[PDB]
Design a protein around this nucleic acid. Structure first.
Ligand SMILES: [Mg+2]
Ligand SMILES: [Mg+2]
Ligand SMILES: [Mg+2]
Ligand SMILES: [Mg+2]
Ligand SMILES: [Mg+2]
Ligand SMILES: [Mg+2]
Ligand SMILES: [Mg+2]
Ligand SMILES: [Mg+2]
Ligand SMILES: [Mg+2]
Ligand SMILES: [Mg+2]
Ligand SMILES: [Mg+2]
Ligand SMILES: [Mg+2]
Ligand SMILES: [Mg+2]
Ligand SMILES: [Mg+2]
Ligand SMILES: [Mg+2]
Ligand SMILES: [Mg+2]
Ligand SMILES: [Mg+2]
Ligand SMILES: [Mg+2]
Ligand SMILES: [Mg+2]
Ligand SMILES: [Mg+2]
Ligand SMILES: [Mg+2]
Ligand SMILES: [Mg+2]
Lengths: 138, 50, 176, 190, 199
RNA sequence: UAGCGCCGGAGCCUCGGUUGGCCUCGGAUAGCCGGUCCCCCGCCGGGGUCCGGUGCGGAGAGCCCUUCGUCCCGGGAAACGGGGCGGCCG
RNA sequence: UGUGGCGGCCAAGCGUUCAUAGCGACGUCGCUUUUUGAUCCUUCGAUGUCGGCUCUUCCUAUCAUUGUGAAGCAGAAUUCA
RNA sequence: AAUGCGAGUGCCUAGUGGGCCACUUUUGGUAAGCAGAACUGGCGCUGCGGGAUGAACCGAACGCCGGGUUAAGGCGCCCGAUGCCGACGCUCAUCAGACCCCAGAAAAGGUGUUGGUUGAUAUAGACAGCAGGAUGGUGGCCAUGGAAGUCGGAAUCCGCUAAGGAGUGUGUAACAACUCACCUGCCGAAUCAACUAGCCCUGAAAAUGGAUGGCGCUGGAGCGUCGGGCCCAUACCCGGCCGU
RNA sequence: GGGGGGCCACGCGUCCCCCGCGAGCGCACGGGGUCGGCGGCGAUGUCGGCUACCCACCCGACCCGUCUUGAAACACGGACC
RNA sequence: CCGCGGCGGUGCGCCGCGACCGGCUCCGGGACGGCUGGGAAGGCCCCGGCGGGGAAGGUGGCCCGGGGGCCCCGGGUGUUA
């Protein structure tokens, strides 16, 4: 059962292509596998785009099927898309993959030390919870 | 290579593949470039090309 | 003609040689679809040699420009009138496409004829392209997109990029 | 061309309780439960409507062969609703010229023995499908009655017992003998 | 140091072609559950395709002729060998690094099995196209051990289910312990958040 | 099983390749995953409800381990912890 | 592949009626190399040249037998597939 | 006139005088890897890259090497190169298809599916699907042993009409018997026919076991139209060395 | 022709139309590479030897002579020295 | 004869490294300008302003139908709310 659809005013995330990693708003459907799309606040010009290169999100903004970039901007700013997208967990893990790639060699050593200590502290509590659960039953 | 075409390719001094030459254009030149048309690729050069 | 890449849409004007008989020939304008202007002039001379009695040596190209799309940011219905050769017989058609540009619609038409009727680009002869209103369309494949509240999902997302995680552990998901 | 959306609709009555696990339709009511699995059709089934009065079948981006399967499901689910509410009854006569077709019923309706078909000494033993009960009826001379909930199983058992009594290496236009399906209907009327 | 590739749901030629390059690249590959491999096209067509292979024997002495192996593992091995220069000593050394099996042998039951998405049915085939299981195809051309392999696979699945429940028990225990020591792991966790490891 | 087998420091030849490990659900794809059991059945398992994630973060785009060494004195963490001999399960 | 053999398409007619159960003129399209031709590429410092006997395997364009469909199939017998 | 190139001339002279193949033109023959011509290019005399293999096909002709780049071909694996998040379509074969020569098919068909051309009728309510009614003249005249709306052939007109025609089916010696067309009944949105063009299927049968080169391939590794990127010949460019 | 930036323009003394030598000093996209730069190992087990002895692997690769349009030929001659 | 002396040439026993210069290549990153229909479109200025139109892939409304706690869905009228 489907939950995200291609309608007029669907926010999509562009996964690859030249405008990769950007949000766009679907303005009209040209063909079976192509939409006229426009991101006013994400620096995307109004252009044709295949459905293969967009990952559609759960954000719906209301504007007519032929309204121009001014009205799509006005609908984007009232719906306040750019902060809700960053508040969603999808952009948080995109930002996490960007941080882990930007991560340097000194940052690698510090993450190494902290992860080692945190893992040892977690494993000690795990062993204590094991022996507590075993001592309660047996 | 056909003999009539060999003679024109020698009068254009194109005796080897990927050889190039400058030819001024008139009726007597277009009617020879038509004879050697499938064997050459000619055109109008830029000043930077020269 | 080889339909290379996407086509560009050219306005080509030509005339005959001024003679003592015809001191000024009428100028003839044509709407050529070609990958470049060198192909466009050759197709102009082909079409005008078919219609009028005028050849490339007996005439000249007065103008050859690429005339652009007046509105490439709205989606339009394009009706294209065809004249093609089959293996046995030659036929006319009317086809409909949805595109932003006229040359993009004609480019789509060339792939459509090659796909469906195995018609090569030298047999295809475009004779009239017209912007068509949505109430004047005829093909149900084009008329089904004339919906103000259009809605569909992407039902079976086949996973592309099959070779960057090439040896993976989790099995791929197609539902999104 | 691919149609964007094709949908059809089954109106479910209030006597029937229906549930779905993906593309597996389960139907429960007065006579029992029927389960049919539809993972080979690749459509979208929706149990919309509060108290589940209505069932909707969707095909998105389908060709002409794929759009034919929608009302096939809408007929199968209606057949299950009809067979759980009213049931299925296949009344069938036996036609003979000289030798009376002797039909006896074994193991509470799950096996049927046919004797004296065209004067033969061979005994045709017909197994029935699980869920179908066969019985010799009354008020008619030579007639059997098949009972069940599944139209597939009932009619397939009727086809089995009809093809059991077939005439070999003769003119079948003249030797019009066998057990033939006469009437298809329900257990109780509507 | 070794690939273990699960054969279930994979297409036979695409999987075999992908294995054939990696095993020529000096890597040890072990392809497991060859009865779960499936072939595009309908089942009767694929059965006829194998029956035409069965009919091709040496007329004067069939003991020297083509060896028609009936196990699914040996069928997949025969497909991989046809994608290799097996009459040369680098091809034979490549064929030595391939190890095909039916079911999951007990070396590879407690080992994690990799998946090739470029050879899977659900990726490389349309959903409205029929396919043929190699296990049933081999069973109907003369593989005798479909029934034994089925019970031995089921007895393994009920055994690995217990391991999965014990693993989920430790997963609930570690997620409980993470909340229990959250006061004292707080300085070590935000430093993992600021470099993208735990966001 | 005949000068041979089984267990507990030295070196000499020869054959070579490698330069951390992943100790595991079943599987579905027009669908999944994990909790919760306040419900209902059982041999902790099975169904349903409910709550969370789903371009998989309880993510292989992943996880674990990470080695310069030793010494003195502290502050975190351990105290149920680190390593060394006989038995029971599987 | 002319010729031989085999198979189609159209259907004027035969079939008491009825083109196509079974056939099929006038035309026309093919297949095969178990017929004879046509050709001369291999072999003239030699490939033992007709049959029959013996023995093995293959083909199907199926005479019989297994399973079947159609008749101008009542049964029996017989045709077509 | 243009373009290009140093030319002219005299002795002596070997080998050859069986040829063959290809685009186009073309003779005889049913045809032939048949026989015989014209033109040009090849093979013979010649290796190299590609066509899996290969006298002649495509590219390109060759001193010994290094670097780079190409042609014709290709880029799932054999096997160098697409492991591009390539584009748009078409196609399911229980005989799929897969690249000049070239190595296997035709007429005729298909309510498989896709795209077109043309003509109808549809809210003055159509195609389905479930009834009435097909007769009065007339059992028409015609030719018959008789053909009565039905076995032949000239004809082919009226009434009542919501309809109804000297008429499409099954049958008798002529009878008897029986139904599409046309009209209303219910129902409420597009429907019907004739052609034509792609892929697939039928037509489609040979002998040792068997060949898109093989493995295999169906969100193609199939067909058509097309993008970038990549592979490499003795070919092209630069450089070294030998010889003329 | 009248009233801020680049110029391979910088003589003096006339007639007249237009109104034959300066020295020096260095730098270098300049007639084909040099360092006025270095580091390791080396006397009974190691250094160099492409070719020549044996073996291994990848790619390529049919036996020569001859007649012939065409030879690896199921065309002839040929055991070896 | 001594010096691990200076300049000039020739070179290292073997294995190696670096520097800059020049020739030939394959790439990458910036920056500047010309032409077109002296680009076509597009952005901002209340829809850039004012006035006049048009109609649908019809927004408000209004009505009709069917599942809801006023919000959705389907159809109809129609010219901007
Ligand atoms: Mg009989
Ligand atoms: Mg004949
Ligand atoms: Mg007759
Ligand atoms: Mg000859
Ligand atoms: Mg001989
Ligand atoms: Mg012999
Ligand atoms: Mg047969
Ligand atoms: Mg000849
Ligand atoms: Mg020569
Ligand atoms: Mg040559
Ligand atoms: Mg070939
Ligand atoms: Mg080279
Ligand atoms: Mg190849
Ligand atoms: Mg040179
Ligand atoms: Mg080789
Ligand atoms: Mg000789
Ligand atoms: Mg000869
Ligand atoms: Mg010769
Ligand atoms: Mg020879
Ligand atoms: Mg031979
Ligand atoms: Mg001789
Ligand atoms: Mg001899």
């Amino acid at each position: 059962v489907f939950r995200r659809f291609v309608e007029v005013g669907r926010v999509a995330y562009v996964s690859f292509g030249p405008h990769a990693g950007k949000l766009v708003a679907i303005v009209d459907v040209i063909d079976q596998n192509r939409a006229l799309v426009d991101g006013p606040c994400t620096r995307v010009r109004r252009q044709a785009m295949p459905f293969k290169c967009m990952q559609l999100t759960d954000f719906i903004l209301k504007f007519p099927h032929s309204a121009r970039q001014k009205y799509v901007r006005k609908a984007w700013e009232k719906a306040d898309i750019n902060t809700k997208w960053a508040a969603t967990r999808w952009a948080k893990k995109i930002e996490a993959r960007e941080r882990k790639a930007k991560m340097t060699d000194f940052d690698r050593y510090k993450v190494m030390k902290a992860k080692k200590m945190r893992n040892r502290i977690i494993k000690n509590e795990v062993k204590k919870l094991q022996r507590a659960a075993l001592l309660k039953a047996s | 290579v056909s003999p009539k075409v060999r003679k024109v390719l020698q009068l254009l001094r194109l005796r080897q593949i990927f050889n190039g030459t400058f030819v001024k254009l008139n009726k007597a030149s277009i009617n020879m470039l038509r004879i050697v048309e499938p064997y050459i690729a000619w055109g109008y050069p830029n000043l930077k090309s020269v | 003609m080889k339909a290379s890449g996407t086509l560009r849409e050219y306005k080509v004007v030509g005339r005959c040689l001024p003679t003592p008989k015809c001191r000024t020939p009428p100028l003839y304008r044509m709407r050529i679809f070609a990958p470049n202007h060198v192909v466009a002039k050759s197709r102009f001379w082909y079409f005008v040699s078919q219609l009028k009695k005028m050849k490339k040596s007996s005439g000249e190209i007065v103008y050859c420009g690429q005339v652009f799309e007046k509105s490439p940011l709205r989606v339009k219905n394009f009706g294209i009138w065809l004249r093609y050769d089959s293996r046995s017989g030659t036929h006319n058609m009317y086809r409909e496409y949805r595109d932003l540009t006229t040359a993009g619609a004609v480019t789509q038409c060339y792939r459509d004829m090659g796909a469906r009727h195995r018609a090569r680009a030298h047999s295809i002869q475009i004779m009239k392209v017209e912007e068509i209103a949505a109430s004047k369309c005829r093909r149900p494949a084009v008329k089904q997109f004339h919906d103000s509240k259009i809605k569909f999902p992407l039902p079976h997302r086949v996973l592309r990029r099959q070779h960057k995680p090439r040896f993976t552990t989790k099995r791929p998901n197609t539902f999104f | 061309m691919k149609t964007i959306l094709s949908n059809q609709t089954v109106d479910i009555p209030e006597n029937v309780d229906i549930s779905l696990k993906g593309r597996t339709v389960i139907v429960k009511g007065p006579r029992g439960t029927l389960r049919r699995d539809f993972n080979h059709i690749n459509v979208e089934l929706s149990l919309l409507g509060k108290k589940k009065k209505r069932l909707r079948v969707d095909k998105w981006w389908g060709n002409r062969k794929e759009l034919a399967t929608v009302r096939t499901i809408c007929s199968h689910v209606q057949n299950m609703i009809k067979g759980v509410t009213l049931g299925f009854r296949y009344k069938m006569r036996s036609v003979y010229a000289h030798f009376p077709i002797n039909v006896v019923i074994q193991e509470n309706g799950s096996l049927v023995e046919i004797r004296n078909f065209l004067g033969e000494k061979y005994i045709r033993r017909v197994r029935m499908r699980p869920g179908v009960a066969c019985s010799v009826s009354q008020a008619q001379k030579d007639e059997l009655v098949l009972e069940g909930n599944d139209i597939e199983l009932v009619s397939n058992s009727a086809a089995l017992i009809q093809q059991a009594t077939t005439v070999k290496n003769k003119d079948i236009r003249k030797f019009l003998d066998g057990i033939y399906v006469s009437e298809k209907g329900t257990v109780q009327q509507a | 140091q070794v690939l273990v590739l699960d054969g279930r749901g994979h297409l036979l030629g695409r999987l075999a072609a992908i294995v054939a390059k990696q095993v020529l690249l000096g890597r040890k590959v072990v392809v497991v559950r060859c009865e779960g491999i499936n072939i595009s096209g309908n089942f009767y067509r694929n059965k006829l395709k194998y029956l035409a292979f069965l009919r091709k024997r040496m007329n004067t002495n069939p003991s020297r002729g083509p060896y028609h192996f009936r196990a699914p593992s040996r069928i997949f091995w025969r497909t991989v060998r046809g994608m290799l220069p097996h009459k040369t000593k680098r091809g034979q050394a490549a064929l030595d690094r391939l190890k095909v099996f039916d079911g999951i042998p007990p070396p590879y039951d407690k080992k994690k099995r990799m998946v090739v998405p470029a050879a899977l049915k659900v990726v490389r085939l349309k959903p409205t196209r029929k396919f043929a299981y190699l296990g049933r195809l081999a069973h109907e051309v003369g593989w005798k051990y479909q029934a034994v392999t089925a019970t031995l696979e089921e007895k393994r699945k009920e055994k690995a289910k217990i391991h999965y429940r014990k693993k989920k028990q430790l997963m609930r225990l570690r997620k409980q312990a993470e909340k229990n020591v959250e006061k004292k792991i707080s300085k070590f966790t935000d430093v993992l958040k600021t470099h993208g490891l735990l966001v």
